[PDB]
Ligand binder design. Structure first.
Ligand SMILES: COc1cncc(C(=O)NCCNC(=O)c2ncccc2O)c1
Length: 167
């Protein structure tokens, strides 16, 4: 038993809710919150901008030190940093950005990072400003992630579509 509340169960291990991931993180304090990161960990907008804003820019300060030491992530890759006031840890995962021409097949590799964590609160990778089809992202999630994932979908209209079209 865990503290996540109000989720619709899609599969044995995947759950989904219409929620603001920032508000959900502040209430649950999960072990892991997933950020929709880019390779530079520049948290300017979308999920990343909202998570970073909720940390009062501490996420960005930590991220800049990470990049200065390690260089950029790979598309499809990830790193574990602090969750600040939102979670114990933040798993920064780089899904392919369609608006940059990145290969959508890398979406499966991106979701594989979730398997290193027993339970996660996460957004749909490559959705929103990353330009992928969220229905496709949900399908890849269900077919790739084997650990317990609680998906927060900000847009109510999208949440209902995602639910109604789920196979
Ligand atoms: C590319 O295919 C698509 C099909 N249908 C919908 C989308 C989409 O992402 N729509 C934007 C949904 N809104 C939000 O996520 C949102 N989040 C936070 C605050 C306010 C907000 O409106 C994409």
């Amino acid at each position: 038993v865990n503290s996540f509340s109000g989720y619709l169960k899609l599969t044995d291990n995947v759950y989904i809710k219409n929620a603001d991931i920032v508000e959900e993180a502040k209430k649950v304090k999960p072990t892991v919150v997933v950020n929709a990161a880019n390779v530079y960990l520049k948290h300017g907008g979308g999920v990343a901008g909202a998570l970073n804003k909720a940390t009062n820019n501490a996420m960005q300060v930590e991220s800049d030190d990470y990049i200065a030491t390690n260089g950029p992530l790979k598309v499809g890759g990830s790193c574990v940093l602090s969750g600040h006031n939102l979670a114990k840890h933040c798993l920064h995962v780089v899904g392919p950005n369609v608006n940059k021409g990145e290969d959508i097949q890398l979406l499966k590799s991106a979701y594989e990072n979730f398997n290193q964590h027993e339970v996660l609160l996460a957004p749909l990778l490559s959705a929103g400003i990353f330009g992928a089809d969220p229905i496709h992202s949900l399908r890849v999630c269900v077919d790739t992630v084997r650990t317990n994932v609680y998906l927060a979908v900000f847009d109510k209209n999208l949440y209902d579509k995602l639910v109604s079209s789920f196979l």
